[PDB]
């Protein structure tokens, strides 16, 4: 459920004895924990949400020139005054322009003036701030068994039913219980702080488009500031790379606005991530965090159920994912009650030999109605597939053949572990989560080295580490001494493979 | 931006009467509401603060409650002194805006 | 009225699309393949500069990349 | 006792711009953020804007922006609010009132506020006109 | 929308001045100088790379500023 | 004589949008409106689940597109060597106290 | 409260065209398929055709294949249905209805439907004539 | 496509009879039916959805069942607002198609 066709989903499980299972939530991506116990359980971040945004100096790249000025002077009284300079609503600079005979001052030679206009300006760009705090994470999770196609279509009452809930995290109350009643109580504990390093990511909201940037890169911007201000005439700070002053070869300066830059930032923006609706309320997309699960309290809710002998049939050919999983709606009437179904697989039968991956554990029907849908999934191995549901000779076959074979899991299972390792970089570690030794030293090694990594190479460029993993193969290769040869095969095999991220 | 309904527009009553009058902004205002009543002429009379909150002074004959986006004001029992315009208006935010007004009427 | 940064130099790598990646892990190649496709010569002017330097057959085509990549942006 | 004063009630020409002053009474000057808020004769109350009377720190809504200016006079205790490019909306009458916890230069709303949020002292209201 | 071409990549060497020259002949510095005060480790990690090539006490100066000089804008 | 050769627009306006999706396997989408050039699409592959009509599910398909209106043209105009005119003003010394154009 | 409300009847040319409004109200415009459906005053209903609100998706009958256009007006919540070349049997009333799980962009049956299939506003219909 | 009967074609009873319609389709249209009535200038009446479902503000006075190709409608007990034409219509396959009618009328 909720997790099905949502590919860069993951199954973790938690060598039972001590539930510590800290997962890596993802909003972009489902996780679906499991265990012998503790009805099978998913969770998936819906939205990223930010309450208090702070107004920092706005920009603007849409200016207009009124009223010129010029205010020319004699290459010997001194240079230009112009007092329309005294204000600052007015842009100027002062120029050494030519003056000669015929021209008024009796002298000659170089003189000079002060061309000047006023700065009138629209099109601000809003780059409001963000804190770790008063930010919330809002998250929404389901368990297995029941509700017959999940399907977020009608969430709304899903949470106020058992096998969704919702739930709200803050880094002031990061724990949450999520309680299924007849479920269980779902223990959360999170870091709202080291998901998207923040405190240096700044809220730009510029033609009601709203993205979040490296609060570096804003400062650095070349543009006008409204520098921090509040109402009152917007006093613009630099004022000049907006405006260009350009005179003839020795006379006459005249002023250009380079009308609006609206695209230029689009193309200057490469980088960033958009955002949506922002009220005092700006949601955004995608963004991770470390999230402890406890299963504290999770009963089970039918273990004693019976298994009905109604005759089950199909309705939807159960396709499989990416995962290699497959996922059957199975309806049936002719029985009644909160039923327990059975559901395993084989490779013959007169054996039933229950083999293979068992995902929705103890599924449950709810009433007497007729055909009621129960959805579920299971993972068959490798080969030919007997995917077998009712109960015994009025039951309900299928083959399968998953088609992936063992050594091709591993496949699978690495590269999307590497794609963790790359994207989430520590947070990768503990994903798999016990308290293990060897867990703590990968996830502190990598603090440390990939902290070095970042500091060192910083925020290199797609091009940039493409072309420096280049020279370091080229290198790994000629120095002697294979120690720090090698160190630079290594070096220049991480960037290139940071080389093979998402983009692809 | 700070839309501010306060309903309703008018009443009158009898004296020793209770009245309430509602609130209810677009926004949410957790506790930063306020509530006047004033005099055609006058400055305003001591009532509210915070929309849960009796001022010094302040006769106990008014009350004022809500907790989210809508809040309720009560006169317990009407009395002569209490022909006036009610206002309720919010705190937050700083487009500072008030209610058009509750009025009275004595019978 | 230099809009300056370029913001990919602060990259959110984060698992939801960026702005505009679609064209931005392409727009740099298209920028040195146009500006050379309009500058050809050039090609050997680079060859020779390189040539002249490292001295070492591997680090000239390196000194090639550092002409042919100083070219196209800062001019 | 802490009361504010206002002056007296005025009228200008359209166009030009109205000083009207509020004097302070019975508290320290300088702890007490000056609100504005005008009313016209049948409409409801609506804040124009703030001032710091330490520092003269000033801000205000976009309904004013550019011909509101608000200063600080610290040695009797005042603040004078000038109206500019006067309009036939502007007749009206305009209250001044202290506010809150006026630690340094501002309105600092996100803190707390109420025990006399801005009512204390509304004074006696300044009654303006705009015609000729 | 990259407006790829900074036509100053085709500058008319003609009397009268050009467009925004003014700017111009200091947005680059102006660039390369606020990339690297917003990443400055950078600096000793192209000092540790180019350290690595050349070989030569005078060539690695060089790869100093090829490194220094793709950096900015090519990111 | 200047000859009006292309122009170019950079302030365009859209409306009327249109996404016309598809089925995992039913084609893929047509969107009859992609049908006019005023009219700019562009097509894309979209996912397509349960619970979303299609009672396959997997990598479905649809077009994007909406009109593409446009105003502030740019008039790039060509001129020739021909039919230009230069204009030129000389003078003389000695006479013509304060000449001075 | 959810309800359509259709255009005025109208009376057009043969082989005219003529376009009802249905603007909706109680709901998120965005979340209900459109149906149009016919019927003749002795006749029978018989479905014309639908609509999805968003992205402006349509389909219909071949009974009105080349004559059927169905827009979306997404500002006022409002669906637009023009019958094209206008024929005698046209002369009928004309009804538009809200509809199922309208999720992203179709008529989308094999997932399920009801619960106020398409009936809960069916606004008033639209009679047209058609003649001169 | 898809040919659905309706019948029959009128009734004619006194309040407070029960009435059935019957409809049965040439295929299979499991649970996908509804049911109407109209007056004549009317948008019709709330009657059924799913062939078997009450809806809100629907009086029980109406049921639907059926489950595989044919379906029964039932008035329990008849009343003046009961006069219109009742339709049976079809969801699936989407050539969706109506019932011609079974029309009503007091004594
Ligand atoms: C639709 O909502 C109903 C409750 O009204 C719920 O039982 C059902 O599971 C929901 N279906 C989907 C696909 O969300």
């Known amino acids: 459920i909720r997790c099905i066709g949502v590919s860069n989903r993951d199954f973790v499980e938690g060598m039972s004895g001590g539930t510590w299972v800290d997962v890596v939530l993802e909003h972009g991506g489902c996780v679906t924990v499991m265990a012998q116990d503790k009805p099978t359980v998913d969770i998936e971040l819906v939205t990223t949400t930010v309450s208090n945004m702070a107004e920092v100096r706005s920009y603007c790249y849409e200016a207009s020139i009124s009223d010129m000025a010029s205010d020319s002077r004699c290459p010997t009284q001194g240079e230009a005054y112009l007092d329309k300079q005294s204000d600052t609503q007015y842009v100027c600079k002062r120029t050494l322009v030519d003056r000669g005979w015929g021209n008024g001052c009796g002298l000659f030679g170089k003189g000079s003036l002060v061309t000047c206009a006023k700065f009138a300006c629209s099109k601000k760009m809003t780059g409001k701030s963000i804190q770790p705090e008063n930010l919330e994470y809002r998250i929404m999770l389901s368990v297995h068994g029941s509700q017959h196609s999940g399907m977020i279509v009608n969430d709304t009452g899903h949470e106020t039913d058992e096998n969704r809930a919702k739930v709200e995290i803050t880094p002031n109350s990061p724990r949450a219980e999520a309680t299924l009643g007849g479920f269980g109580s779902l223990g959360l504990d999170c870091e709202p702080r080291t998901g998207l390093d923040f405190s240096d990511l700044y809220y730009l909201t510029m033609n009601n488009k709203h993205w979040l940037v490296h609060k570096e890169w804003f400062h650095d911007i070349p543009l006008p500031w409204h520098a921090g201000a509040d109402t009152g005439t917007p006093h613009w700070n630099n004022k000049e790379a907006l405006v260009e002053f350009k005179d003839a070869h020795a006379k006459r300066q005249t002023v250009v606005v380079l009308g609006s830059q609206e695209g230029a930032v689009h193309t200057a923006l490469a980088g960033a991530l958009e955002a949506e609706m922002d009220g005092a309320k700006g949601r955004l997309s995608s963004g991770h965090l470390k999230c402890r699960l406890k299963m504290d309290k999770l009963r089970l809710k039918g273990v004693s159920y019976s298994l009905c002998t109604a005759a089950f049939t199909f309705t939807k050919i159960p396709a499989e994912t990416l995962h290699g999983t497959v996922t059957v709606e199975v309806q049936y009437a002719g029985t009644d009650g909160p039923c327990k179904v059975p559901a395993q697989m084989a490779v013959d039968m007169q054996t039933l030999t229950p083999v293979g991956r068992l995902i929705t554990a103890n599924p449950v029907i709810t009433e007497s109605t007729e055909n009621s849908k129960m959805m579920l999934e299971l993972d068959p191995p490798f080969g030919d597939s007997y995917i077998v549901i009712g109960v015994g000779e009025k039951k309900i076959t299928h083959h399968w053949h998953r088609s992936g074979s063992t050594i091709g899991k591993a496949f699978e299972a690495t590269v999307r572990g590497a794609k963790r390792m790359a994207v989430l970089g520590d947070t990768a570690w503990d994903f798999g989560s016990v308290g293990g030794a060897l867990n703590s030293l990968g996830k502190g090694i990598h603090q440390i080295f990939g902290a070095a990594f970042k500091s060192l190479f910083g925020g290199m460029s797609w091009f940039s580490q493409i072309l420096i993993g280049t020279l370091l193969m080229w290198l790994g290769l000629n120095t002697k001494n294979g120690s720090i040869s090698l160190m630079c095969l290594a070096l220049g095999g991480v960037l290139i493979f940071l080389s093979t991220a998402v983009s692809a | 931006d700070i839309q501010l309904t306060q309903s309703p527009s008018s009443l009158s009553a009898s004296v020793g009467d209770r009245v309430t009058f509602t609130c209810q902004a677009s926004?949410?205002?957790?506790?930063?509401l306020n509530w006047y009543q004033q005099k055609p002429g006058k400055a305003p009379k001591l009532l509210i603060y915070?929309?849960?909150n009796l001022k010094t002074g302040v006769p106990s004959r008014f009350s004022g409650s809500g907790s989210g986006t809508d809040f309720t004001f009560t006169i317990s029992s009407l009395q002569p002194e209490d022909v006036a315009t009610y206002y309720c208006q919010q705190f937050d935010d700083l487009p500072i805006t008030f209610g058009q007004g509750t009025r009275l009427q004595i019978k | 009225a230099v809009t300056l940064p370029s913001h990919s130099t602060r990259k959110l790598q984060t698992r939801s699309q960026t702005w505009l990646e679609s064209r931005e892990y392409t727009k740099h190649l298209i920028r040195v393949e146009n500006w050379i496709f309009r500058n050809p010569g050039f090609a050997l002017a680079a060859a020779a500069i390189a040539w002249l330097l490292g001295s070492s057959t591997s680090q000239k085509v390196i000194y090639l990349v550092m002409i042919l990549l100083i070219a196209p942006a800062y001019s | 006792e802490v009361q504010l004063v206002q002056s007296g009630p005025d009228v200008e020409k359209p166009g030009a711009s109205v000083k009207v002053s509020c004097k302070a009474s019975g508290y320290t000057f300088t702890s007490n953020y000056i609100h504005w808020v005008r009313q016209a004769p049948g409409q409801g109350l609506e804040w124009m804007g703030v001032?710091?009377?330490?520092?003269?720190?000033?801000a205000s809504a976009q309904k004013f922006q550019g011909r509101i200016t608000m200063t600080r006079d610290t040695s009797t205790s005042t603040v004078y609010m000038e109206l500019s490019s006067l309009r036939s909306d502007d007749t009206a009458v305009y209250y001044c009132?202290?506010?809150?916890?006026?630690?340094?230069?501002?309105?600092?709303?996100?803190?707390?506020?109420?025990?006399?949020?801005?009512?204390?002292?509304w004074g006696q209201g300044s009654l303006v006109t705009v015609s000729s | 929308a990259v407006t790829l071409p900074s036509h100053s990549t085709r500058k008319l060497q003609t009397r009268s001045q050009t467009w925004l020259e003014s700017r111009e002949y200091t947005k680059h510095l102006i660039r390369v100088e606020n990339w690297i005060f917003r990443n400055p480790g950078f600096a000793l990690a192209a000092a540790a790379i180019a350290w690595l090539l050349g070989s030569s006490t005078s060539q690695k100066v060089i790869y100093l500023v090829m490194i220094l000089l793709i950096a900015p804008a090519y990111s | 004589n200047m000859a009006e050769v292309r122009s170019y627009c950079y302030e365009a306006s859209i409306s009327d949008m249109a996404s016309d999706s598809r089925c995992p396997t039913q084609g893929e989408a047509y969107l009859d409106k992609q049908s006019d050039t005023q009219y700019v699409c562009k097509r894309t592959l979209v996912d397509r689940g349960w619970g979303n009509g299609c009672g396959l599910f997997g990598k479905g398909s649809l077009v994007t597109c909406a009109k593409f209106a446009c105003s502030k043209k740019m008039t790039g105009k060509s001129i020739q060597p021909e039919n230009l005119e230069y204009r030129i003003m000389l003078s003389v010394h000695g006479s013509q106290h304060s000449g001075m154009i | 409260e959810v309800q359509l409300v259709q255009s005025g009847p109208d009376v057009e040319k043969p082989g005219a065209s003529v376009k009802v409004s249905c603007k909706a109200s109680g709901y998120t415009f965005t979340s209900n398929y459109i149906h149009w459906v016919r019927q003749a005053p002795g006749q029978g209903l018989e479905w014309?055709?639908?609509?999805?609100?968003?992205?402006?998706?349509?389909?219909?009958?071949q009974k009105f294949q080349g004559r059927i256009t169905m827009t979306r007006d997404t500002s006022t919540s409002t669906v637009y249905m023009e019958l094209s070349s206008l024929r005698s049997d046209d002369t009928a009333v004309?009804?538009?209805?809200?509809?199922?799980?309208?999720?992203?962009?179709?008529?989308?049956?094999?997932?399920?439907?009801?619960?106020?299939?398409?009936?809960?506003?069916?606004?008033?219909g639209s009679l047209v004539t058609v003649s001169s | 496509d898809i040919q659905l009967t309706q019948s029959p074609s009128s009734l004619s009873a006194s309040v407070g009879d029960r009435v059935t319609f019957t409809c049965?389709?040439?295929?299979?249209?499991?649970?996908?039916?509804?049911?109407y009535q109209q007056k004549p200038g009317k948008a019709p009446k709330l009657?059924?959805?799913?062939?078997?479902?009450?809806?809100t503000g629907v009086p029980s006075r109406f049921s639907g069942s059926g489950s595989g190709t044919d379906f029964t409608f039932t008035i329990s007990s008849l009343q003046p607002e009961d006069v219109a034409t009742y339709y049976c219509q079809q969801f699936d396959d989407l050539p969706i198609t109506f019932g011609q009618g079974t029309r009503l009328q007091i004594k």
């Open positions: 001032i710091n009377p330490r520092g003269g720190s000033t």
């Open positions: 926004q949410d205002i957790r506790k930063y």
């Open positions: 915070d929309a849960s």
């Open positions: 009132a202290r506010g809150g916890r006026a630690l340094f230069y501002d309105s600092y709303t996100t803190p707390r506020d109420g025990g006399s949020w801005w009512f204390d002292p």
